[PDB]
Design a protein around this ligand. Structure first.
Ligand SMILES: CNCc1nccn1C
Length: 330
Protein backbone atom coordinates (compact mmCIF):
# COMPACT_ATOMS: atom_id res chain seq x y z
CA UNK A 1 0.00 0.00 0.00
CA UNK A 2 0.87 3.67 -0.17
CA UNK A 3 -0.43 7.01 1.06
CA UNK A 4 0.00 10.60 -0.15
CA UNK A 5 -1.20 13.73 1.64
CA UNK A 6 -0.67 17.42 1.13
CA UNK A 7 0.94 19.37 3.96
CA UNK A 8 0.21 23.10 4.27
CA UNK A 9 1.96 25.92 6.17
CA UNK A 10 -0.09 27.16 9.13
CA UNK A 11 0.82 30.80 8.48
CA UNK A 12 2.78 33.13 6.22
CA UNK A 13 6.08 32.30 7.93
CA UNK A 14 5.93 28.51 7.60
CA UNK A 15 5.99 28.23 11.40
CA UNK A 16 4.72 24.67 11.04
CA UNK A 17 2.85 22.47 8.58
CA UNK A 18 -0.47 20.68 8.96
CA UNK A 19 -1.63 17.56 7.22
CA UNK A 20 -5.20 16.25 7.28
CA UNK A 21 -5.66 12.91 9.04
CA UNK A 22 -8.82 10.80 9.20
CA UNK A 23 -9.52 9.26 12.61
CA UNK A 24 -12.37 6.93 13.51
CA UNK A 25 -15.57 5.71 11.91
CA UNK A 26 -17.17 7.73 10.44
CA UNK A 27 -14.02 9.67 9.79
CA UNK A 28 -13.18 12.70 11.89
CA UNK A 29 -10.63 14.77 10.02
CA UNK A 30 -8.07 16.62 12.13
CA UNK A 31 -5.14 18.71 10.94
CA UNK A 32 -2.02 17.31 12.55
CA UNK A 33 1.60 18.46 12.71
CA UNK A 34 3.70 15.58 11.37
CA UNK A 35 6.75 15.53 13.61
CA UNK A 36 9.81 13.42 12.81
CA UNK A 37 11.25 14.53 16.16
CA UNK A 38 8.66 12.82 18.37
CA UNK A 39 6.71 9.56 18.49
CA UNK A 40 3.23 10.24 19.87
CA UNK A 41 0.08 10.70 17.82
CA UNK A 42 -2.06 12.92 20.05
CA UNK A 43 -5.11 15.03 19.42
CA UNK A 44 -7.29 17.70 20.91
CA UNK A 45 -10.41 15.87 21.99
CA UNK A 46 -13.74 15.89 23.75
CA UNK A 47 -11.70 15.12 26.89
CA UNK A 48 -9.47 18.21 26.64
CA UNK A 49 -9.96 20.71 29.47
CA UNK A 50 -12.51 23.14 28.00
CA UNK A 51 -10.57 26.31 28.87
CA UNK A 52 -7.58 24.91 26.95
CA UNK A 53 -9.46 24.48 23.66
CA UNK A 54 -9.64 27.58 21.42
CA UNK A 55 -10.71 26.92 17.85
CA UNK A 56 -9.11 23.51 17.30
CA UNK A 57 -11.05 20.64 15.81
CA UNK A 58 -11.49 17.88 18.38
CA UNK A 59 -11.62 14.10 18.20
CA UNK A 60 -14.67 12.67 19.98
CA UNK A 61 -14.03 8.97 20.55
CA UNK A 62 -17.62 8.32 21.70
CA UNK A 63 -18.73 9.16 18.16
CA UNK A 64 -16.39 6.60 16.59
CA UNK A 65 -17.70 3.06 16.30
CA UNK A 66 -14.13 1.75 15.97
CA UNK A 67 -12.70 3.59 19.01
CA UNK A 68 -11.66 1.52 22.02
CA UNK A 69 -10.27 2.85 25.28
CA UNK A 70 -6.79 1.43 25.83
CA UNK A 71 -7.39 0.49 29.43
CA UNK A 72 -5.02 2.02 31.98
CA UNK A 73 -2.87 3.78 29.40
CA UNK A 74 -1.75 7.37 29.88
CA UNK A 75 0.72 9.64 28.14
CA UNK A 76 2.62 12.83 28.90
CA UNK A 77 5.07 14.63 26.67
CA UNK A 78 7.26 17.73 26.79
CA UNK A 79 8.66 19.31 23.64
CA UNK A 80 11.87 21.20 22.95
CA UNK A 81 10.03 24.52 22.77
CA UNK A 82 8.77 24.20 26.36
CA UNK A 83 5.24 23.08 25.46
CA UNK A 84 3.54 19.93 26.73
CA UNK A 85 0.41 17.82 26.70
CA UNK A 86 -0.96 14.71 28.39
CA UNK A 87 -3.98 12.43 28.63
CA UNK A 88 -5.33 8.94 28.02
CA UNK A 89 -5.36 6.64 25.00
CA UNK A 90 -7.73 5.05 22.52
CA UNK A 91 -7.06 2.73 19.64
CA UNK A 92 -8.87 3.60 16.43
CA UNK A 93 -8.59 3.58 12.65
CA UNK A 94 -6.29 6.26 11.28
CA UNK A 95 -5.82 7.11 7.62
CA UNK A 96 -3.34 9.45 5.97
CA UNK A 97 -3.70 10.21 2.30
CA UNK A 98 -5.43 6.89 1.58
CA UNK A 99 -3.15 4.72 3.77
CA UNK A 100 -5.07 3.12 6.64
CA UNK A 101 -3.85 1.68 9.93
CA UNK A 102 -6.29 -0.12 12.19
CA UNK A 103 -5.64 -0.25 15.92
CA UNK A 104 -3.49 2.88 15.93
CA UNK A 105 -2.90 4.42 19.35
CA UNK A 106 -4.63 7.80 19.32
CA UNK A 107 -3.58 9.72 22.40
CA UNK A 108 -6.39 11.94 23.63
CA UNK A 109 -5.34 15.14 25.36
CA UNK A 110 -6.82 15.96 28.73
CA UNK A 111 -4.35 18.83 29.19
CA UNK A 112 -2.39 20.95 26.75
CA UNK A 113 -0.04 23.87 27.47
CA UNK A 114 -0.76 27.46 26.51
CA UNK A 115 1.08 27.54 23.19
CA UNK A 116 -1.05 24.65 21.91
CA UNK A 117 -4.27 26.37 23.03
CA UNK A 118 -3.18 29.62 21.44
CA UNK A 119 -2.57 28.00 18.05
CA UNK A 120 -5.97 27.32 16.53
CA UNK A 121 -4.52 25.71 13.41
CA UNK A 122 -2.92 22.60 14.95
CA UNK A 123 -5.30 19.88 16.15
CA UNK A 124 -2.53 17.60 17.42
CA UNK A 125 0.74 15.94 16.42
CA UNK A 126 1.56 12.79 14.48
CA UNK A 127 4.97 11.54 15.57
CA UNK A 128 7.31 9.96 13.03
CA UNK A 129 10.47 9.46 15.07
CA UNK A 130 11.26 5.95 16.38
CA UNK A 131 8.68 4.22 18.56
CA UNK A 132 11.21 3.91 21.39
CA UNK A 133 10.39 7.58 22.20
CA UNK A 134 6.65 6.97 22.51
CA UNK A 135 5.44 8.15 25.93
CA UNK A 136 2.46 5.85 26.49
CA UNK A 137 2.62 4.05 29.82
CA UNK A 138 2.61 1.29 30.97
CA UNK A 139 2.65 -0.19 27.45
CA UNK A 140 4.58 1.84 24.89
CA UNK A 141 2.78 2.28 21.57
CA UNK A 142 3.95 2.29 17.96
CA UNK A 143 3.91 5.24 15.58
CA UNK A 144 1.63 5.38 12.55
CA UNK A 145 4.63 4.67 10.32
CA UNK A 146 5.80 1.73 12.45
CA UNK A 147 2.30 0.23 12.27
CA UNK A 148 2.00 0.80 8.52
CA UNK A 149 5.53 -0.26 7.55
CA UNK A 150 5.02 -3.95 6.83
CA UNK A 151 2.07 -3.17 4.54
CA UNK A 152 3.83 -0.44 2.59
CA UNK A 153 5.21 -1.10 -0.89
CA UNK A 154 8.59 0.09 0.47
CA UNK A 155 9.26 0.83 4.16
CA UNK A 156 9.77 4.57 3.70
CA UNK A 157 8.10 7.93 3.95
CA UNK A 158 9.12 11.18 2.36
CA UNK A 159 8.85 14.82 3.37
CA UNK A 160 8.60 17.44 0.63
CA UNK A 161 7.88 20.68 2.50
CA UNK A 162 7.13 23.85 0.57
CA UNK A 163 8.50 27.33 1.04
CA UNK A 164 5.45 29.54 1.59
CA UNK A 165 3.48 26.86 -0.28
CA UNK A 166 1.95 23.41 0.19
CA UNK A 167 4.01 20.24 -0.05
CA UNK A 168 3.61 16.50 0.36
CA UNK A 169 4.11 13.59 2.73
CA UNK A 170 4.22 10.25 0.93
CA UNK A 171 4.21 6.82 2.55
CA UNK A 172 5.48 3.66 0.88
CA UNK A 173 7.01 5.07 -2.29
CA UNK A 174 9.49 7.59 -3.67
CA UNK A 175 8.03 10.04 -6.18
CA UNK A 176 10.86 10.33 -8.70
CA UNK A 177 9.20 13.38 -10.27
CA UNK A 178 9.44 15.35 -7.02
CA UNK A 179 13.18 16.08 -6.99
CA UNK A 180 16.06 16.94 -9.27
CA UNK A 181 19.28 14.99 -9.65
CA UNK A 182 19.85 12.01 -7.38
CA UNK A 183 18.99 11.23 -3.77
CA UNK A 184 22.07 10.98 -1.55
CA UNK A 185 21.62 8.59 1.34
CA UNK A 186 23.41 8.93 4.65
CA UNK A 187 23.69 6.81 7.80
CA UNK A 188 21.28 7.17 10.71
CA UNK A 189 21.77 6.49 14.40
CA UNK A 190 18.58 5.51 16.22
CA UNK A 191 20.28 5.48 19.64
CA UNK A 192 18.43 8.59 20.84
CA UNK A 193 15.22 7.62 19.03
CA UNK A 194 15.64 10.32 16.38
CA UNK A 195 16.47 10.42 12.69
CA UNK A 196 20.00 11.39 13.68
CA UNK A 197 22.67 11.81 11.01
CA UNK A 198 25.95 13.61 10.34
CA UNK A 199 26.17 16.45 7.86
CA UNK A 200 29.55 16.74 6.13
CA UNK A 201 29.81 20.54 6.37
CA UNK A 202 28.48 23.90 5.29
CA UNK A 203 28.97 27.04 3.24
CA UNK A 204 27.62 30.56 3.66
CA UNK A 205 26.42 32.25 0.46
CA UNK A 206 28.99 31.86 -2.32
CA UNK A 207 31.71 31.11 0.24
CA UNK A 208 33.94 28.08 0.32
CA UNK A 209 32.58 24.86 1.74
CA UNK A 210 33.86 23.95 5.20
CA UNK A 211 34.26 20.20 5.65
CA UNK A 212 33.22 19.43 9.21
CA UNK A 213 31.01 16.79 10.80
CA UNK A 214 27.76 18.12 12.22
CA UNK A 215 25.64 15.56 14.07
CA UNK A 216 21.98 16.46 14.14
CA UNK A 217 18.39 15.33 13.71
CA UNK A 218 16.02 15.67 10.77
CA UNK A 219 13.00 17.19 12.52
CA UNK A 220 9.94 18.25 10.57
CA UNK A 221 8.34 19.37 13.85
CA UNK A 222 10.89 22.13 14.54
CA UNK A 223 10.59 25.39 12.57
CA UNK A 224 14.20 26.54 12.44
CA UNK A 225 17.72 25.30 11.73
CA UNK A 226 19.71 24.97 14.95
CA UNK A 227 23.47 24.52 14.49
CA UNK A 228 26.68 24.98 16.52
CA UNK A 229 27.45 28.53 17.62
CA UNK A 230 30.57 28.66 15.45
CA UNK A 231 28.57 27.86 12.29
CA UNK A 232 25.76 30.24 13.16
CA UNK A 233 28.17 33.10 13.93
CA UNK A 234 29.85 32.57 10.57
CA UNK A 235 26.49 32.81 8.84
CA UNK A 236 25.22 35.99 10.56
CA UNK A 237 28.61 37.70 10.20
CA UNK A 238 27.72 37.96 6.49
CA UNK A 239 24.60 40.02 7.24
CA UNK A 240 25.21 43.71 8.01
CA UNK A 241 23.70 44.68 11.33
CA UNK A 242 22.87 41.14 12.43
CA UNK A 243 23.36 40.37 16.10
CA UNK A 244 22.46 37.89 18.78
CA UNK A 245 19.87 39.42 21.07
CA UNK A 246 19.48 37.87 24.51
CA UNK A 247 16.23 39.79 25.00
CA UNK A 248 14.65 38.48 21.80
CA UNK A 249 16.17 34.99 22.19
CA UNK A 250 18.43 34.65 19.19
CA UNK A 251 19.91 36.24 16.14
CA UNK A 252 18.02 39.15 14.66
CA UNK A 253 18.81 41.15 11.55
CA UNK A 254 17.65 44.31 9.80
CA UNK A 255 14.53 43.57 7.81
CA UNK A 256 16.10 45.60 4.98
CA UNK A 257 18.84 42.98 4.57
CA UNK A 258 19.26 40.57 1.68
CA UNK A 259 20.14 37.24 3.32
CA UNK A 260 22.80 34.92 1.90
CA UNK A 261 22.04 31.27 1.21
CA UNK A 262 23.25 28.50 3.51
CA UNK A 263 24.52 25.20 2.13
CA UNK A 264 24.74 21.95 4.10
CA UNK A 265 26.54 18.75 3.11
CA UNK A 266 24.98 15.33 2.73
CA UNK A 267 27.92 13.08 1.94
CA UNK A 268 29.49 14.59 -1.16
CA UNK A 269 26.17 16.26 -2.10
CA UNK A 270 25.06 19.78 -1.21
CA UNK A 271 21.66 21.18 -0.27
CA UNK A 272 21.28 24.93 -0.72
CA UNK A 273 18.86 26.84 1.49
CA UNK A 274 17.98 30.12 -0.25
CA UNK A 275 18.43 33.26 1.81
CA UNK A 276 14.71 34.02 1.79
CA UNK A 277 14.03 30.75 3.65
CA UNK A 278 16.03 32.15 6.60
CA UNK A 279 13.77 35.21 7.07
CA UNK A 280 11.18 34.82 9.85
CA UNK A 281 9.95 38.35 9.69
CA UNK A 282 9.56 41.17 12.22
CA UNK A 283 10.22 40.21 15.84
CA UNK A 284 7.00 42.00 16.75
CA UNK A 285 4.38 43.59 14.51
CA UNK A 286 5.74 46.69 12.81
CA UNK A 287 9.34 46.14 13.87
CA UNK A 288 12.22 46.60 11.44
CA UNK A 289 14.18 43.93 13.31
CA UNK A 290 13.63 40.50 11.79
CA UNK A 291 14.11 37.06 13.35
CA UNK A 292 16.66 34.70 11.89
CA UNK A 293 15.91 31.20 10.68
CA UNK A 294 19.34 29.85 11.61
CA UNK A 295 19.97 29.85 15.35
CA UNK A 296 22.46 28.40 17.79
CA UNK A 297 21.88 24.94 19.23
CA UNK A 298 24.16 25.71 22.19
CA UNK A 299 21.29 25.75 24.70
CA UNK A 300 19.64 22.59 23.32
CA UNK A 301 22.18 19.79 23.46
CA UNK A 302 21.52 18.66 19.88
CA UNK A 303 21.68 20.18 16.40
CA UNK A 304 18.35 20.25 14.62
CA UNK A 305 17.74 20.26 10.90
CA UNK A 306 14.25 21.70 11.17
CA UNK A 307 11.89 22.97 8.51
CA UNK A 308 14.21 25.75 7.31
CA UNK A 309 16.67 23.06 6.16
CA UNK A 310 14.27 20.27 5.24
CA UNK A 311 12.06 22.42 3.02
CA UNK A 312 15.07 23.01 0.74
CA UNK A 313 15.14 19.27 0.00
CA UNK A 314 13.18 16.19 -0.87
CA UNK A 315 13.82 14.02 2.19
CA UNK A 316 13.54 10.24 2.41
CA UNK A 317 13.02 8.65 5.79
CA UNK A 318 14.05 5.08 5.05
CA UNK A 319 12.69 2.74 7.70
CA UNK A 320 14.39 -0.41 6.45
CA UNK A 321 15.98 -2.76 9.00
CA UNK A 322 18.95 -0.40 9.06
CA UNK A 323 17.34 3.02 8.69
CA UNK A 324 18.90 5.73 6.53
CA UNK A 325 18.06 9.27 5.42
CA UNK A 326 18.09 10.50 1.84
CA UNK A 327 18.29 14.09 0.58
CA UNK A 328 17.78 15.45 -2.93
CA UNK A 329 17.59 18.97 -4.30
CA UNK A 330 14.28 19.96 -5.85
C1 LIG B 1 3.93 26.06 19.81
N1 LIG B 1 4.32 24.99 20.76
C2 LIG B 1 3.49 23.78 20.65
C3 LIG B 1 3.69 23.12 19.32
N2 LIG B 1 2.94 23.32 18.26
C4 LIG B 1 3.41 22.45 17.30
C5 LIG B 1 4.45 21.73 17.78
N3 LIG B 1 4.64 22.14 19.07
C6 LIG B 1 5.66 21.60 19.98
Amino acid sequence: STGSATTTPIDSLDDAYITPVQIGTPAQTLNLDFDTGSSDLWVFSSETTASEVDGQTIYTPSKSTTAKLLSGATWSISYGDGSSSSGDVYTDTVSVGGLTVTGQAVESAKKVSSSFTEDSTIDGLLGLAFSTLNTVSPTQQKTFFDNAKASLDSPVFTADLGYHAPGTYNFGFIDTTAYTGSITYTAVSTKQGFWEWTSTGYAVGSGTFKSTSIDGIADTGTTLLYLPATVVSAYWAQVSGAKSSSSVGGYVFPCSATLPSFTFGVGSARIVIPGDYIDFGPISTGSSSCFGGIQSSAGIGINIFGDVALKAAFVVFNGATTPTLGFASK
